Design a protein around this nucleic acid. Structure first.
Ligand code: CA
Lengths: 378, 371
DNA sequence: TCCGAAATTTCGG
DNA sequence: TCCGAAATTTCGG
């Protein structure tokens, strides 16, 4: 179970929020996200790949006892989409002032807009009281046209708490078709994201970056590559010995020039296998911290398989990454591969952290005007 | 060489039956389908994508010694079109009573009509002595309008023999423009067709499904996808080694939710790569059975505009599928990539059957009113 | 006579 | 990467 006064972060690539509610035990919960969140005993939850539409936000955006922040594509339906939910504790709770949401933002670039008046619209970069900040040079040749296109697929939601913690929930592109246009989009997204994180860290923000990064960081987290190199997994807790016996191949997995995204992602992890990780990384893999590097077969995705978790198959591309200043707060971190309903499994981590501000305009009830989703609309 | 009890099935996406007669050796046959069928020594033949018109049926629908069953669009000329031809054996032949055509049908839904009199027509679903059967719930919400729309492009011809064999000749939609409405039409056509196959199989018919399915079943039948995954082909007979090293991509190819037509086609294949194919599928890929899964680059279509036929870079979308009840009959099966005349190549399979009547009204002489 | 539940087969990933 | 969810077939008062 979870401790009494810790915040449980939960990430889950549901691969269709409507479809995941068709599996036990969630099929018994009448499509109630509140029942799901109480089932996992979670307080800050992010769901990636919602595959939803604006009409359905009247259901996923109103959760009793929670704040809802949801980002979907502007026009394309049933594609991508990220949601983040912050539990509202009671006034007599010690984490009441900590879990106060002071800001909320959509995207990584800051060029996305929020309703400002009748026909007016202002982006997050121009409003310092609503934008979280850290937009200082995310890319060398980044104009508004490319930044809006980079944020056009509903892949990021940002939430800032009163205790100075910025939660960044991402569903990074995967480039599943192996195209040149898709690979450049993937690399540009990752570089802008990690740069945005580095900017917020210099300002002094405690950063929790979690979600589906679609990047494998170490060789031991790739069932396909371990079979390609004929490396047998005999000891389920023999990860350190495997990385010592195959030190050369473990490093080649990261710095492989055919896969620069693996190198870019490792360059921000302080606990990376690269020797100079502690001199350049600022984020810590919470799951690898608690489970250690000995645990093998610690996979969070089994592509296209929602009903079974086969052996010798799968990867780990779902993470909960925290700033160095939050390493001393990690009390628990694991995965839940027995949960069915998606080709991904949930990942959770418990952190011990221990005037009024209006609700941010990006809250789902305001961003999507849920008070008007009535009969003619539905 | 073939025995006396051997039946040669042949399928060919001619892509314009008039244009296919321009190439060797068919240009010296004076546009005689009888000469073409004798050239292949074939007994049951289906040509897809005829691109003909009602005026020209008087030639393609009157083949000496053959029954002719041709389906074309109602109004659109030079588009789609399917034809099936059954050889009429002599009375001194052991397969004379087996090759008797007892029924014939147009389309997959049965909602199409047939001539009955003067200003009065009846569909195949209402007449039991003309319809083949198996119409029981082919789709959840299928009305008369959407079904006739599904059978409006002349893409299917069904023929039932006296020995219980039902030959289904199809030219399934391809969705070339890659539109949302076209993908739904393709998916609904493929679902209704395969459901009609399972219904006729439960009734007890020995089904032979052949034609242009426009769907790749396995990764090894797609030069495009093999190059996308950066899978080189060195040994032309190393299909088992390729599928073993790339087992993940081979299975993800079948169950990929982004390409559901590949999943739907696989569920009816008894020889599908999935673990439950033996209990779940009812059809056998004759070409894959005889050529085995080792033969790579067994393509039946190539992009002519990109000149990919010389290098044998293409796909296999043309099949001859048979019921499990006909499994022990398959004596030979191969593709014929050396035959010119189209951007596809023919496919054949030999079945040993080893086992008068009024001609159906859908025959070409009755359906299109021939003198 | 509608109703539903167990048993069974088929489906999608 | 076989497995749970969906559909259907069966059974009976
Ligand atoms: Ca709780």
């Amino acid at each position: 179970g979870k401790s009494e006064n810790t915040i449980r972060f939960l990430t889950f690539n549901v691969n269709g929020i409507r479809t995941f509610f068709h599996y036990q035990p969630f099929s018994q919960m009448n499509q109630s996200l509140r029942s799901v969140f109480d089932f996992f005993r979670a307080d800050i939850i992010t769901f990636q790949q919602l595959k939803t539409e604006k009409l359905s936000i009247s259901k996923w955006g109103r959760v009793d006892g929670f704040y809802s922040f949801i980002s979907i594509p502007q026009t394309r339906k049933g594609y991508s989409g990220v949601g983040c939910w912050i539990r509202i504790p009671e006034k007599n709770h010690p984490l009441y002032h900590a879990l106060q949401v002071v800001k909320a933002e959509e995207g990584i670039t800051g060029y996305l807009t929020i309703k400002n008046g009748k026909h007016s619209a202002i982006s997050y970069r121009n409003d310092v009281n609503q934008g979280i900040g850290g937009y200082d040079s995310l890319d060398p040749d980044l104009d508004e046209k490319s930044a809006l296109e980079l944020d056009s697929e509903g892949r990021c939601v940002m939430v800032e708490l009163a205790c100075g913690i910025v939660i960044i929930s991402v569903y990074c592109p995967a480039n599943s078709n192996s195209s040149e246009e898709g690979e450049m989009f993937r690399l540009r997204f990752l570089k802008v994201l990690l740069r945005r994180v580095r900017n917020l860290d210099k300002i002094g923000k405690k950063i929790v970056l979690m979600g589906n990064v679609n990047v494998c960081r170490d060789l031991i987290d790739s069932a396909d590559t371990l079979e390609q190199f004929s490396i047998p997994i005999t000891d389920p807790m023999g990860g350190t010995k495997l990385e010592a016996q195959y030190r050369d191949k473990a490093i080649q997995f990261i710095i492989n020039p055919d896969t620069p995204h693996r190198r870019i992602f490792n360059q921000i992890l302080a606990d990376s296998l690269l020797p100079d990780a502690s001199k350049r990384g600022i984020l810590i893999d919470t799951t690898r911290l608690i489970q250690t590097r000995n645990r093998l077969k610690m996979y969070t995705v089994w592509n296209m398989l929602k009903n079974l978790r086969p052996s010798n198959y799968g990867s780990r591309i779902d993470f909960i990454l925290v700033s160095l200043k939050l390493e001393r707060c990690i009390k628990a971190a694991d995965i839940l591969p027995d949960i069915l309903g998606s080709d991904h499994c949930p990942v959770y981590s418990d952190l011990d952290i221990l005037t009024q501000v209006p609700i941010p305009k990006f809250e789902a009830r305001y961003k999507y005007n849920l008070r008007n989703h009535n009969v003619l609309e539905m």
